[PDB]
Amino acid sequence: RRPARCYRYCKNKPYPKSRFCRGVPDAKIRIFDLGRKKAKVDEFPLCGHMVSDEYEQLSSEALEAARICANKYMVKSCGKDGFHIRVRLHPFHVIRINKMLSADRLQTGMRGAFGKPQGTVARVHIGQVIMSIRTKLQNKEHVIEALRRAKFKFPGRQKIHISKKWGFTKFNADEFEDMVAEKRLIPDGCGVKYIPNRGPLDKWRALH
Amino acid sequence: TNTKGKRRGTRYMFSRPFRKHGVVPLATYMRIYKKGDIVDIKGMGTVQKGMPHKCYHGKTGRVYNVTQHAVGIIVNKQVKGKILAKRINVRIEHIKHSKSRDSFLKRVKENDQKKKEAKEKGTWVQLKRHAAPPREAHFVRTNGKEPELLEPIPYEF
Amino acid sequence: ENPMRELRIRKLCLNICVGESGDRLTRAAKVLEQLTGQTPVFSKARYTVRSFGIRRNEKIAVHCTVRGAKAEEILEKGLKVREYELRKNNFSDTGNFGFGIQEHIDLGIKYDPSIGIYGLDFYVVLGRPGFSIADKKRRTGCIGAKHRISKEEAMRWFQQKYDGIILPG
Amino acid sequence: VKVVKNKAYFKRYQVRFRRRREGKTDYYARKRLVIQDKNKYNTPKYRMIVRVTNRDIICQIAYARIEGDMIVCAAYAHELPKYGVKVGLTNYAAAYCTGLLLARRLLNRFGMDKIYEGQVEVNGGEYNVESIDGQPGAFTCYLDAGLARTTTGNKVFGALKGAVDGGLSIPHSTKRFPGYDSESKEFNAEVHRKHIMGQNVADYMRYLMEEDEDAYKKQFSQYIKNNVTPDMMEEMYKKAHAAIRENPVYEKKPKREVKKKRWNRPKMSLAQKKDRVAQKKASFLRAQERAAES
Amino acid sequence: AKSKNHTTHNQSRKWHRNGIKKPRSQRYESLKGVDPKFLRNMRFAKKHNKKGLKKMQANNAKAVSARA
RNA sequence: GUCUACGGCCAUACCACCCUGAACGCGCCCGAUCUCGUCUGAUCUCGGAAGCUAAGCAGGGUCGGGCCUGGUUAGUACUUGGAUGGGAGACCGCCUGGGAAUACCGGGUGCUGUAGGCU
RNA sequence: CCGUGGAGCAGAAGGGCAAAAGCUCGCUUGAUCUUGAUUUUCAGUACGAAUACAGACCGUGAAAGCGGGGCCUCACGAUC
RNA sequence: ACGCAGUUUUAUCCGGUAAAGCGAAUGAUUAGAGGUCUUGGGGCCGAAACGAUCUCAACCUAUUCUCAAACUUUAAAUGGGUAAGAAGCCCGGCUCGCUGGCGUGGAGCCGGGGUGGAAUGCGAGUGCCUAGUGGGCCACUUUUGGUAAGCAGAACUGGC
Ligand SMILES: [Mg+2]
Ligand SMILES: [Mg+2]
Ligand SMILES: [Mg+2]
Ligand SMILES: [Mg+2]
Ligand SMILES: [Mg+2]
Ligand SMILES: [Mg+2]
Ligand SMILES: [Mg+2]
Ligand SMILES: [Mg+2]
Ligand SMILES: [Mg+2]
Ligand SMILES: [Mg+2]
Ligand SMILES: [Mg+2]
Ligand SMILES: [Mg+2]
Ligand SMILES: [Mg+2]
Ligand SMILES: [Mg+2]
Ligand SMILES: [Mg+2]
Ligand SMILES: [Mg+2]
Ligand SMILES: [Mg+2]
Ligand SMILES: [Mg+2]
């Protein structure tokens, strides 16, 4: 297999798996959530994020290795069934390889060198989150250490940031505990449904 | 090597706009087209009988011939070296009037009316257009309200 | 009470579906001639499955529609052998119910040794005065909400008119 | 249980034209009936529109325009009681009379009522109004069938015969008039004029009076109210034709109107809607509060 | 012996050296492509004009000259 | 303030449900002898006028769904031209100009062209 | 009963189409003659294809109208 | 002043890239929550039973994470065409074998009256003959194949 040095930057347009590829090797990652998926939104208050600082490509094998490292550290730091990690980045760009002469000069040099697909990578932009972990209020240093351990395995340069949002929802942590008391947010498993005011009156009669 | 064709590369040019499919509106047929009027060309996909070439899409030209279901337009097509005045016979489904000529006619009517009206009064009215002149010296007012101070916000991720 | 909400049978469709085409299908067409007093029409081969011996463009079934007093009389003749027991699953959500019967000897037809043995489907559609809006061409319009027949209304009308009994499916 | 039409369906749904949604037009026959060849730049295309509704028949003549179909003249069926036909405002003879009235009114408005008198003696045969030299040309107009199925013996074709007898140069054929045999391709004008003069309805009335009195009492109730026997219909239309051809002009109706009342309910304003919403919100909690404390 | 296939480099300069001026616009451009019936009618109207022009137009010119 | 016939724009005017419709008109509706066509007068065609606004239709309502418009997103993502600007690169900042869209929120929901009947 | 195209339009795709260009029915060869101009690669040369006309004879519907091949983008060939 | 412009200004359309979206169409896509009409796999009352019950798979609903050069609601900048007058407008009268209710419409011709019509800059138009060329390369930026190349192949501009 080729190294990751030759498939680091974004030099070509996205080449996803569609009716035109007609052939592709399977990806390396199969699962993205490793913590307790059936956790409620009031279980894990805080959440971290691995935000990329460089616009590059991340390989699915690198994502797999990093999430394995993070899970291995987390299940030892805060024990099993006490966290929830998620790899937000999904690999869809398919990189192609051109095998060189199966060693003699009998075959063609560069005649018809479009090559065959080799694997799948994930394109990440500047400021895009790679991984995000939610835990209790006291596992801040544990999440930070797990994300630091995943940093040493991810290529390029990406930093760690503890978002002000509440868990995975798009709402802040300060305006969450007061907005969930009165009927404006409905917890539905790992997510929260935001009920607007521009609806039928039956949805409001069902509450309260 | 690029597969030159009559309708190559018009997938989005000759397609009908979103939520506007169906039969053609009947207002575009009752419009009058005489010889000498300046019109515009816009290819339509609803009908395929007398549609123009993909190179004349969005081109403006004058009419030189009129027939039953079509019009003849003289279009200035810029070939690699020079411009050719080409006569094209296109149906009325793809042709609409140009509002530039209508605005010019309205302006010339306003001018020949203003001059005819001001000739008696003897006032030399300035009917010739001009660019936007630099604004003159004006007096702002603060009405005792102190101007608000602006400060750049500190950086936050 | 209701000015013109009286329910009424719009039509009664009879259908005889046989397996193969030929003499048996022709006899199933002849029986409807004397049963309904009008020539039936053939329906043929919507698809091709070949799992029981049918192909594309092959005459399969015969059918017809009766309207008016003759339709009511044929429905009465069918409910006579049905003995006026209808199941709850016979009624559709739109209000149309069908029952189906055995071979037509019980309807009151003189048996012929040349015709054979055939039954029918006997599907009934109910209506109200004003359902012909969705059928005309000069102006088309939906029926509505309070005017369309419901599920319970069909069985209530049946029990009120023919004094039949509704059995749980 | 099963997927249905949803927000994604309504976001992509494109509505048809208004005149097509309720089914009043087709926009296919109109595209060929209204559009004028660009060689005739501003020459209008005159079309006579005949619509047979319940208890009425409306005949107009209109031409194309950007703002809307400009109608030059119009005739109706409720005017026949003023010309001498009180009963039967939707018969084939009524269609003939209203077509003749429309033609005569258009010609009298254009001043060409003297020339182009048309076929006065009704015989059932084709006329094919021709132009006369040294005089204004005949009014060339076309027909608008609309949504009705064009079948031999239609009231639209009856009005067409009335107009072509009144003097409107309209291209047509004799195979669509009543009396055209289906087995043979020949046409008979005697049966056509019998159907025009309204003799089939007279035969029906006589048959009912001979067989069943209850049928003659149920049907033709307005006929027996206006005591018009089947033998008088042969002369009543002959008299109505002469009356129409003698007085084709239409009088102007009284413009006097009365004060108007707010018969239809108006839309409540935003403040009223918001107050209704607030009342519905506030009076709901008290119900459950009372049910809990009680 | 592979060589360059097709480029349009250094072409706008060659065009702008001589000029890309518009075609010569002149009154009475042409009558080609016009409807043959319309052209026949125009020829007839042009050839039958002098029959009635030189008398009625002359009378009207004398009249308007007497007016002013 | 309204409808009918013919129409322009073609959802501000479509979809589901719930209320109102006086006098014309639209229609529902009653009947196959003539014109006409099907298995069936259901649909299309010549005869209506015994009842009805039940339906269509016309208005009103839904903290309605869609559609249009306006804020927020946001001078943000992008981009014309410039530098002997930074960085190893990936990329980024600056000067001179233009400037997007989804979430979120608020407001509306038919206007008119010709002929005609009413209060 | 719901059903805005989620089917079909001979075949690779794109565009387009709902009382329709889709299926069925009835008559039909305008898939026939003739001279020009114009569009498309273009040197603005030719072939191929295509557009709008005009002059005669016909098809079709009652009629306005449509038709001188396939709903459009390819399906084809100088001298002697 | 005729006229012209690798330009700007004013009106005017043309487009489907950048960006953005898929709780909007199509095709990919992770996880949770509720409802279960039905289907399939388990456990329970017990001669068996759509007589009843717990759970999983499947379906539906409202959300949720990430993408499309051969997807798109919406949609930039840059850019493409036209017009900014005397070859134009108002008035009157003739011709038509074109069209036609109409002295209707539309073209052509004649006759008299009225130029100051966005900024800036510049002298323009046209005919004939004609050598050399018909192997290119490099650079900012946008990009195709390639791991990459002082590699191969494109768009504007500049340079050798
Ligand atoms: Mg190595
Ligand atoms: Mg339908
Ligand atoms: Mg038609
Ligand atoms: Mg070369
Ligand atoms: Mg018959
Ligand atoms: Mg019969
Ligand atoms: Mg009937
Ligand atoms: Mg009603
Ligand atoms: Mg009601
Ligand atoms: Mg709403
Ligand atoms: Mg730059
Ligand atoms: Mg296709
Ligand atoms: Mg399509
Ligand atoms: Mg011809
Ligand atoms: Mg493109
Ligand atoms: Mg993109
Ligand atoms: Mg080389
Ligand atoms: Mg190179």
Concatenated DSSP letters of C126-148: EE-TTGGGTT-SS------SSSS
Determine, for residues D22 and C137 on separate chains, whether the beta-carbon distance falls below 8 Å.
no
Q: How many CB atoms lie within 10 A of CB C158?
A: 22
**Coil vs helix vs strand at A63:** helix
Q: Which two tokens stand for residue D172?
A: 């047509």
Q: In what order do the strands lie in the sheet with A93-97?
A: A56-59, A116-124, A93-97
Helix (H) or strand (E) holding A120: strand A116-124
**Chain C residues 58-77, Cβ below 7 A from strand F:** 64-68
Q: Which two tokens stand for residue D117?
A: 């008198």
Percentages helix, strand, coil for chain B, rounded to the nearest 5? Answer: 20, 20, 60
- Report how far residue C55's alpha carbon sits from residue C25's, in angstroms, rounded to the nearest whole number: 15
- Report how far residue D43's alpha carbon sits from residue D36's, in angstroms, rounded to the nearest whole number: 8
- As a whole number of Å, the end-to-end CA separation of chain E is 87
Give the length of chain C: 169
Question: Inter-axis angle of helices D189-196 and D92-110, to 10 degrees?
Answer: 90
**Coil vs helix vs strand at A148:** helix
- Per-residue burial over B104-117, b if 16 or more Cβ lie within 10 Å, else e, is eeeeeeeeeeeeee
Among protein residues, the one whose C-alpha sits closest to the C1' atom of H34 is A188
- Which class for D63: exposed (0-12), middle (13-18), buried (19 or more C-beta within 10 A)? middle
Does residue D16 lie within 7 Å of nucleic acid chain G, judged by its CB? Answer: yes
CA distances from E60 to E49, E53, E65, E66 (A): 16, 10, 8, 10
Alpha helices in chain E (DSSP H): 12-18, 36-47, 49-67
Q: Among partner residues D277, D280, D285, which is closest to A208 by beta-carbon distance?
A: D285
Asked whether B87 and B67 are in contact (CB, 8 A), the reply is no
Q: How far is the CA of D10 from the C1' of G9 (A)?
A: 27
- Which class for A168: exposed (0-12), middle (13-18), buried (19 or more C-beta within 10 A)? middle
- Per-residue burial over A54-69, b if 16 or more Cβ lie within 10 Å, else e, is eebbbbbbbbbbbbeb
Q: How many CB atoms lie within 10 A of CB C138?
A: 14
Contacts of C167 (CB under 8 A, 6+ apart): C85, C86, C87, C88
Judging contacts by C-beta atoms under 8 Å, the chain B residues touching residue E11 are 80
Q: How many CB atoms lie within 10 A of CB D109?
A: 14
On strand G, nucleotides with any atom < 7 Å from a protein CB are: 1-5, 14-21, 36-44, 48, 51-55, 61-67, 71-74
Chain B residue with CA closest to D44: the answer is B30
**Torsional sign, CA E54, E57, E59, E63:** negative
CA distances from A76 to A61, A70, A81, A143 (A): 23, 10, 11, 12
Interface test with D, best of C138, C139, C142 (most D CBs within 10 A): C138
Half-sphere exposure of C31 (CA within 13 A, CB side): 30
**Chain C residues 78-137, Cβ below 7 A from strand F:** 128-133, 135-137
- Kindly identify the ligand whose nearest atom is closest to the C-alpha of D182: 5
Contacts of D233 (CB under 8 A, 6+ apart): D93, D197, D198, D199, D201, D202
CA distance E58 to chain B (A): 30
**Torsional sign, CA A16, A17, A19, A23:** positive
SS (H, E, C) chain D: CCCCCCHHHHHHCCCCCHHHHCCCCCCCHHHHHCCCCCCCCCCCCCEEEEEEECCEEEEEEEECCCCCCEEEEEECCCCHHHHCCCCCCCCHHHHHHHHHHHHHHHHHHHCCCCCCCCCCCCCCCCCCCCCCCCCCCCCECEEECCCCCCCCCCHHHHHHHHHHHHCCECCCCCCCCCCECCCCCCECHHHHHHHHCCCHHHHHHHHHHHHCHHHHHHCCHHHHHCCCCCCCHHHHHHHHHHHHHHCCCCCCCCCCCCCCCCCCCCCCCHHHHHHHHHHHHHHHHHHHHHHHHC
Helix (H) or strand (E) holding A93: strand A93-97
- Report how far residue B36's alpha carbon sits from residue E29's, in angstroms, rounded to the nearest whole number: 12
Asked whether B28 and B96 are in contact (CB, 8 A), the reply is yes
Q: Which two tokens stand for residue E16?
A: 């702008």
Provide φ and ψ at B35, rounded to 5°. -80, 130
Judging contacts by C-beta atoms under 8 Å, the chain B residues touching residue D41 are 32, 34, 66
How many angstroms does the Cα of residue E2 sit away from the middle of ligand 18?
13
Which C residues 120-149 touch D at CB under 8 Å?
137-141
Interchain CB contact of E27 with B (< 8 Å): no
CA distance C128 to chain D (A): 21
CA distance B70 to chain D (A): 8
Would strands A131-135 and C97-98 be described as parallel, antiparallel, or unpaired? unpaired
Residue D140: strand pairing partners: D169
Alpha helices in A79-154 (DSSP H): 140-153
Of the candidates C60, C9, C14, which has an alpha carbon nearest to the alpha carbon of residue C37? C14
Nucleotide nearest to D259 (CA to C1'): F119
Half-sphere exposure of D199 (CA within 13 A, CB side): 11
Judging contacts by C-beta atoms under 8 Å, the chain D residues touching residue C139 are 22-24
**Chain A residues 169-198, Cβ below 7 A from strand F:** 194, 196-198
- Report how far residue C155's alpha carbon sits from residue C95's, in angstroms, rounded to the nearest whole number: 8
Give the length of chain B: 157
Judging contacts by C-beta atoms under 8 Å, the chain D residues touching residue A204 are 281
Does residue D111 lie within 7 Å of nucleic acid chain H, judged by its CB? Answer: yes
Judging contacts by C-beta atoms under 8 Å, the chain B residues touching residue D42 are 32
Q: How far is the CA of D86 from the C1' of F113 (A)?
A: 34
Question: Inter-axis angle of helices C69-82 and C23-36, to 10 degrees?
Answer: 110
**Coil vs helix vs strand at B115:** helix
Asked whether D196 and D216 are in contact (CB, 8 A), the reply is no
- Report how far residue D205's alpha carbon sits from residue D229's, in angstroms, rounded to the nearest whole number: 8
- Kindly identify the ligand whose nearest atom is closest to the C-alpha of B15: 13
Chain A residue with CA closest to D282: the answer is A205
Resolution for this PDB entry, in angstroms: 3.1
**Torsional sign, CA D252, D255, D261, D266:** positive
CA distance B86 to chain E (A): 11
Determine, for residues B68 and D37 on separate chains, whether the beta-carbon distance falls below 8 Å.
yes
Q: How far is the CA of A93 from the C1' of H143 (A)?
A: 19
Chain C residue with CA closest to D148: the answer is C138
Q: Which two tokens stand for residue B97?
A: 């009037």
Which D residues 256-285 touch A at CB under 8 Å?
277, 280-281, 284-285
How many angstroms does the Cα of residue D24 sit away from the middle of ligand 6?
30
- Report how far residue A29's alpha carbon sits from residue A4's, in angstroms, rounded to the nearest whole number: 17
**Chain E residues 2-61, Cβ below 7 A from strand G:** 32-33, 35-37
- Report how far residue D52's alpha carbon sits from residue D90's, in angstroms, rounded to the nearest whole number: 8
Asked whether D47 and D159 are in contact (CB, 8 A), the reply is no
Judging contacts by C-beta atoms under 8 Å, the chain E residues touching residue B65 are 33-35
Q: In what order do the strands lie in the sheet with B38-41?
A: B83-91, B70-78, B60-66, B38-41, B95-97
Structure letter (DSSP) for residue A25: P
- Report how far residue D12's alpha carbon sits from residue D125's, in angstroms, rounded to the nearest whole number: 55
Contacts of D74 (CB under 8 A, 6+ apart): D58, D59, D60, D61, D102
Determine, for residues D280 and A201 on separate chains, whether the beta-carbon distance falls below 8 Å.
yes
**Chains in contact with C, where contact requires at least 3 CB pairs less than 8 Å apart:** D
Asked whether A177 and A137 are in contact (CB, 8 A), the reply is no
Asked whether B90 and B59 are in contact (CB, 8 A), the reply is no
Q: In what order do the strands lie in the sheet with A158-162?
A: A84-87, A131-135, A46-52, A158-162
SS (H, E, C) D112-169: CCCCCCCCCCCCCCCCCCCCCCCCCCCCECEEECCCCCCCCCCHHHHHHHHHHHHCCE
Provide φ and ψ at A134, rounded to 5°. -115, 135
Of the candidates C16, C22, C5, which has an alpha carbon nearest to the alpha carbon of residue C150? C5
Residue B78: strand pairing partners: B83
Residues of A with CB under 8 A from a CB of D: 201, 204-205, 208
Angle, CA of A81, A29 and A89, to the nearest 5°: 85
**Torsional sign, CA E57, E63, E66, E68:** negative
CA distance D19 to chain A (A): 33
Judging contacts by C-beta atoms under 8 Å, the chain A residues touching residue D281 are 204
Judging contacts by C-beta atoms under 8 Å, the chain C residues touching residue D149 are 137
Torsion of CA D157, D53, D75, B27, to 10 degrees: -90
Give the length of chain D: 294
- Report how far residue A170's alpha carbon sits from residue A159's, in angstroms, rounded to the nearest whole number: 21
- Report how far residue A114's alpha carbon sits from residue A98's, in angstroms, rounded to the nearest whole number: 7
Of the candidates D64, D57, D66, D143, which has an alpha carbon nearest to the alpha carbon of residue D92? D57
On strand F, nucleotides with any atom < 7 Å from a protein CB are: 1-2, 4-11, 13-19, 22, 25-31, 33-67, 89-92, 104-119
Asked whether D50 and D62 are in contact (CB, 8 A), the reply is no
- Report how far residue B97's alpha carbon sits from residue B67's, in angstroms, rounded to the nearest whole number: 17
Residue C12: strand pairing partners: C66, C124
- Report how far residue C98's alpha carbon sits from residue C87's, in angstroms, rounded to the nearest whole number: 10
**C127-130 contacts, C-beta under 8 A, 24 or more apart:** C127/C7, C127/C8, C127/C9, C127/C10, C128/C4, C128/C5, C128/C6, C128/C7, C128/C8, C129/C4, C129/C6, C129/C8, C130/C4
Q: How was this structure determined?
A: cryo-EM
Does residue B28 lie within 7 Å of nucleic acid chain G, judged by its CB? Answer: no
- Report how far residue D202's alpha carbon sits from residue D186's, in angstroms, rounded to the nearest whole number: 26
Q: Which two tokens stand for residue D15?
A: 């509505």
